[PDB]
From a paper:
M1 from influenza C virus (M1-C) has been shown to be the key component in inducing the formation of protrusions, called cord-like structures (CLS), emanating out of infected cells and in regulating their growth thus demonstrating a role for M1-C in membrane remodeling. We show that the N-terminal domain of M1-C adopts a similar fold as M1-A, despite the low sequence homology of both proteins, but coordinates two Mg2+ ions which increases the positive surface charge and may thus facilitate electrostatic interactions with negatively charged membranes. Full length M1-C adopts an elongated structure that tends to polymerize into ring-like or filamentous structures via lateral interactions of M1-C protomers. Our study thus confirms that M1-C assembly on membranes constitutes the driving force for influenza C virus bud formation.
We solved the crystal structure of C-terminally truncated M1-C, (NTD, residues 1–155) by single anomalous dispersion (SAD) techniques to a resolution of 1.5 Å. The structure is composed of a tandem repeat of two four-helical bundles (helices 1–4 and 6–9) that are connected by a long linker containing helix 5. Interactions between the two four helical bundles and with the linker are hydrophobic as in the case of M1-A structures28293139. The overall fold is similar to known M1-A NTD crystal structures28293139, albeit their low sequence homology. Major changes are observed for the position of helix 6, which moves approximately 10 Å outwards. A notable difference between the M1-A and M1-C structures is the unexpected coordination of 2 Mg2+ ions by helix 5 residues. The first Mg2+ ion is coordinated by Asn80, Asp130, Glu126 and three water molecules and the second Mg2+ ion interacts with Thr83, Glu123, Glu126 and three water molecules. Nevertheless the presence of Mg2+ may not have a structural role since circular dichroism showed no difference in melting temperature (TM = 62 °C) in the presence or absence of EDTA (ethylenediaminetetraacetic acid). However, the presence of the two Mg2+ ions changes the electrostatic potential of the M1-C surface. In the absence of Mg2+ this surface is substantially less positively charged, while in the presence of Mg2+, the basic charge distribution is similar to that of M1-A.
Author numbering: 2 to 155
């Protein structure tokens, strides 16, 4: 569903410059080495992105290629954003994510269970903190659904 992911990332980045957006999108669709390089560029904050835009893009990139190490700024952010969740609540979310299977499943899970922002964000934290615990379909689906949610507020 990486095609839909790319589309949502493009929309998420609509307000940045072309070359810049083009540089990011071209890299993330350019293979593992290209995406890795783009993630390093992102975390070093050389591009003129807002803090939230940079962390969002690093999450997208690590979700695509989990060999990319975690950026503390993004990691810490997801921790704070979900700090009010009981461990039991997160346990339920892990199971439900897995059972969701793919993008359509994950989107449906978020909507039909009327998830709060913190619950959505716990799904994103699961894929960012523990990408290897989830299939590519779940990682991409979760991040796509998350980006779709944000873009609908634009
Ligand atoms: Mg965490
Ligand atoms: Mg958490």
């Amino acid at each position: 569903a990486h095609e839909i992911l790319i589309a949502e990332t493009e929309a998420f980045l609509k307000n940045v410059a072309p070359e810049t957006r083009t540089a990011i999108i071209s890299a993330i669709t350019g293979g593992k080495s290209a995406c890795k390089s783009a993630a390093k560029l992102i975390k070093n904050e050389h591009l003129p992105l807002m803090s939230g835009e940079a962390t969002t893009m690093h999450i997208v990139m690590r979700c695509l290629y989990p060999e990319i190490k975690p950026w503390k700024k993004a990691s810490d952010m997801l921790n704070k954003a979900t700090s009010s969740l009981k461990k039991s609540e997160g346990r339920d979310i892990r199971k439900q994510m897995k059972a969701a299977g793919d993008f359509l499943g994950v989107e449906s899970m978020m909507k039909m269970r009327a998830f709060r922002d913190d619950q959505i964000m716990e799904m994103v934290e699961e894929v960012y903190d523990h990408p290897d615990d989830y299939t590519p379909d779940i990682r991409i689906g979760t991040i796509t659904a998350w980006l779709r949610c944000k873009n609908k507020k634009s």
